[PDB]
């Protein structure tokens, strides 16, 4: 009743939890399928009600005993399934008498013993499954009773070795599976007399050397060994398998494959050798003209024969990824070649004929070579090439002739490729990677639509340097006011009046530092004025040249000198308000200047921290820094500001000189307030950019870096009353 009879009286009773053979079924049924039931044992004459049974499935029950007089009289049985049961051995006595059986499954039974008289009377058996049993050795004598077998699998068993004449009587075997046995040795005649064999699997065994038994297989077509310990493949290994088609030889430590190993193989399709380090000559592939994909990645190939092309007429894929290749013979012919990967070699040039013809060449890859020149029309003859990956080479000039059809171009390396690409040549190019973002800038990115890996990001300006006219005008104003007022303050202080107290000396020195900051801003704005709308051409050499280095040095020197002079002024004011000192203060100022100079020259010779932006300032560090200079400068400046603030507040708590006190207080407040945003934006790229724009970062840095330099002299001139009187008296002196 639980059975679900089909149209052609095919009883299907699976998963019903039965404990015995179903009863009350049609005696004329063909296929019986009791798979997931709990049939522990088969009693005697359990199938007496199914004389015409044709296919019996018992896959899944905890079957552990089959009576000898069970499944008897089933002379029409053809398929028997006993895979996932718990049989500890092949049922030698139970299985006999099935003279019409054509397929037997014994996959998952924990079989460890095979009786010597098993498989008796199976005259026309054609498929055998012994996958997951725990067999120790091949049952040679039991297999001697199956001369009509056509498919044998012993995949997951535990077989140590195959003795001589193991399968001598299997004259009609076709498929042999020995996937995951721990085979370590094969005798010379184990596969003797095993004609008609077409598929041989030895994937995950532990073969030491290359077996010779395959020399006795005259009809082999597919051969596998995936995870053996094979190290050397002697020449002439495959001379006994003229019909061999696929050879699976990977993931094993190959060392030396000889020269003529893959020789005179007519129907071989793909050859893939990786890791054969000791190989130093190209394989003698004469006679193998039907090859379709050839890869020799890891070896020591020194040259490519000129006869590689004009033979293997299909050759849809060529790969040589780790070789000592220096010369590239012309690939004249071989029109079906689609992909070429010649990377990590010693190629030093590409000649005009090197890729002559090459119809349907889609992908070309030379990503690591010592290439320093490319012929003008080296790519003229190319067809529908969609990928040309030429990176990490010593390129100086990249020809573009015959490259209109390119779909993706890579030039990640080639730091010497200062030339700017012409976007006219590449019409339908979609993705491009270039050594510098200024090359991409000519392609109208971020606006037919082309993607670039190095983004301009408004930090390497494709347009004018400063950007908005508001920023340009305010930076010009900052430069003008800083330069003029610092010059005026210096002329008033150091020239006319002979009074030289420590406070006046520090004021003059900080005005000098602000003057240097102003002249840095002035050269920056002069560069921007010169490069109006065409900043890409100027910036392609500004960062590389010494102008960026000298401007960055001036900026960092000015900033550090100003900070150090402010700190020294705070210390001097503290000492003066506490209650000869000229010499020590002067030498301290000299030490501060030398420290600023060495801090400025540190990135000039060390690590090349400049050239990160046209602003040539390592402090904003728009790109991710090495945290060797930026963080050190940030912490040093923060510590100096904290010390100055603590000193100022201590002296204010403790308390003519009030004018100097308030002047220094205003100076400290202005410098700290205007330095805070620069320090904030210094580490902004390092942290996740939650609504953080590189454009606004550049804007803030550009507007706030010279602001203290533009602001200090104005405050000094306008506010200090006694120093204004000094200005008046010195003006009278110079007029007189």
């Amino acid at each position, epitope marked *: 009743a639980p059975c679900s009879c089909d149209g052609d009286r095919r009883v299907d009773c699976s998963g019903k939890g039965l404990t015995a053979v179903p009863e009350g079924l049609s005696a004329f049924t063909q296929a019986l399928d009791i798979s997931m039931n709990n049939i*522990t044992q088969l009693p005697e004459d359990a199938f007496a009600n199914f004389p015409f049974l044709e296919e019996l499935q018992l896959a899944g029950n*905890d079957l*552990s*005993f089959i*009576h*000898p007089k069970a499944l008897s009289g089933l002379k029409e049985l053809k398929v028997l399934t006993l895979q996932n049961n*718990q049989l*500890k*051995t*092949v*049922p*030698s*006595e*139970a299985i006999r008498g099935l003279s019409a059986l054509q397929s037997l499954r014994l996959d998952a039974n924990h079989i460890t*013993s095979v*009786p*010597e*008289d*098993s498989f008796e009377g199976l005259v026309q058996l054609r498929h055998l499954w012994l996958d997951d049993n725990s067999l120790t050795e091949v049952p040679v004598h039991p297999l001697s009773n199956l001369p009509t077998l056509q498919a044998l699998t012993l995949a997951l068993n535990k077989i140590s070795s195959i003795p001589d004449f193991a399968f001598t009587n299997l004259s009609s075997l076709v498929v042999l599976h020995l996937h995951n046995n721990k085979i370590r040795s094969l005798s010379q005649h184990c596969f003797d007399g095993l004609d008609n064999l077409e598929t041989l699997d030895l994937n995950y065994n532990n073969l030491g050397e290359f077996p010779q038994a395959i020399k006795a297989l005259p009809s082999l077509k597919e051969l596998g060994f995936h995870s053996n310990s094979i190290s050397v493949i002697p020449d002439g290994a495959f001379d006994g398998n003229p019909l061999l088609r696929t050879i699976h030889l990977y993931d094993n430590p190959l060392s030396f494959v000889g020269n003529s190993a893959f020789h005179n193989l007519s129907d071989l399709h793909s050859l893939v050798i990786r890791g054969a380090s000791m190989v130093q000559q190209f394989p003698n592939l004469t006679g193998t003209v039907h090859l379709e994909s050839l890869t020799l990645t890891g070896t020591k190939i020194s040259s490519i024969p000129n006869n590689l092309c004009q033979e293997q007429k299909m050759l849809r894929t060529l790969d040589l990824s780790y070789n000592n290749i220096r010369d590239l013979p012309s690939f004249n012919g071989c029109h079906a070649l689609e992909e070429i990967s010649l990377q990590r070699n010693q190629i030093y040039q590409i000649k005009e004929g090197t890729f002559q013809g090459l119809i349907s060449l889609r992908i070309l890859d030379l990503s690591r070579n010592l290439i320093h020149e490319i012929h003008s029309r080296a790519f003229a003859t190319l067809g529908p090439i969609t990928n040309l990956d030429v990176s990490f080479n010593e390129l100086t000039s990249f020809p573009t002739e015959g490259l209109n059809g390119l779909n993706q171009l890579k030039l990640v390396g080639n730091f010497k490729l200062k030339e700017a690409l012409a976007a006219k040549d590449f019409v339908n190019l979609r993705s491009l990677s270039v050594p510098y973002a200024y090359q991409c800038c000519a392609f109208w990115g971020c606006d037919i639509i082309i993607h670039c890996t190095p983004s301009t990001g408004a930090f390497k300006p494709c347009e004018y340097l400063l950007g908005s006219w508001m920023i340009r005008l305010t930076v010009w104003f900052i430069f003008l006011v800083a330069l003029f007022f610092n010059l005026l303050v210096i002329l008033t202080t150091f020239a006319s009046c002979t009074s030289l107290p420590s406070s006046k000396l520090f004021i003059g020195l900080i005005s000098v530092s602000n003057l240097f900051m102003g002249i840095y801003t002035g050269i920056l704005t002069f560069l921007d004025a010169v490069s109006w709308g065409r900043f890409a051409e100027f910036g392609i050499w500004w960062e590389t040249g010494s102008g960026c280095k000298v401007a960055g040095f001036l900026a960092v020197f000015s900033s550090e000198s100003a900070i150090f002079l402010l700190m020294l002024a705070t210390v001097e004011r503290s000492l003066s308000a506490k209650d000869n000192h000229l010499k020590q203060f002067r030498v301290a100022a000299l030490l501060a200047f030398l420290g600023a100079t060495v801090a400025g020259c540190f990135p000039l010779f060390h690590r090349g921290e400049y050239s990160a932006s046209p602003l040539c300032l390592p402090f904003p560090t728009g790109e991710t820094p090495s945290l060797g200079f930026t963080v050190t400068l940030v912490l040093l400046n923060s510590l100096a500001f904290l010390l100055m603030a603590v000193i100022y507040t201590k002296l204010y708590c403790n308390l003519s000189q009030s004018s100097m006190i308030k002047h220094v207080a205003w100076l400290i407040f202005t410098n700290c307030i205007f330095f805070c945003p620069v320090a904030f934006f210094s580490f902004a790229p390092l942290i996740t950019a939650i609504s953080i724009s590189p454009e606004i970062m550049k804007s803030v840095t550009l507007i706030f870096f010279p602001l203290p330099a533009c602001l200090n002299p104005v405050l000094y001139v306008f506010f200090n009353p006694k120093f204004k009187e000094d200005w008046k008296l010195l003006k009278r002196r110079v007029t007189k």
Partner: nanobody
Framework: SLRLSCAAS????????MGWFRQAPGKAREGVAT???????IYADSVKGRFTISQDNAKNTLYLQMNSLKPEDTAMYYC???????????????????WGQGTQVT
């Protein structure tokens, strides 16, 4: 302590590789003691020493004498035999052709 006697009805010549098997409910039939044509005897290791098996070819009957029984040996016992060309020892249930009715021992 007790003795199980097995009698064979069919008789052509000296039967080959007699044996005794034990089955706990809901599992396989393991072998406990077996003999062969020339009288060599193979015992199960877990039952080695205690049980003894003797065949009488005059009446072609098996006898299994069991002593010092333990509660885990409670199971159903069967008497199995074959006739032809058996080289493997009798501990394997597949090689046997004739199986007895089997009794229950507790």
């Amino acid at each position: 302590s007790l003795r199980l006697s097995c009698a064979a009805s069919g008789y052509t010549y000296s039967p080959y590789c007699m044996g005794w098997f034990r089955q706990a409910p809901g599992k396989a039939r393991e072998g406990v003691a077996t003999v062969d044509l020339d009288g060599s005897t193979i015992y199960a290791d877990s039952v080695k020493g205690r049980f003894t098996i003797s065949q009488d070819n005059a009446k072609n009957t098996l006898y299994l004498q069991m002593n010092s029984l333990k509660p885990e040996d409670t199971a159903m016992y069967y008497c199995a035999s074959r006739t032809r060309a058996g080289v493997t020892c009798g501990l394997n249930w597949a090689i046997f052709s004739y199986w007895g009715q089997g009794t229950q021992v507790t």
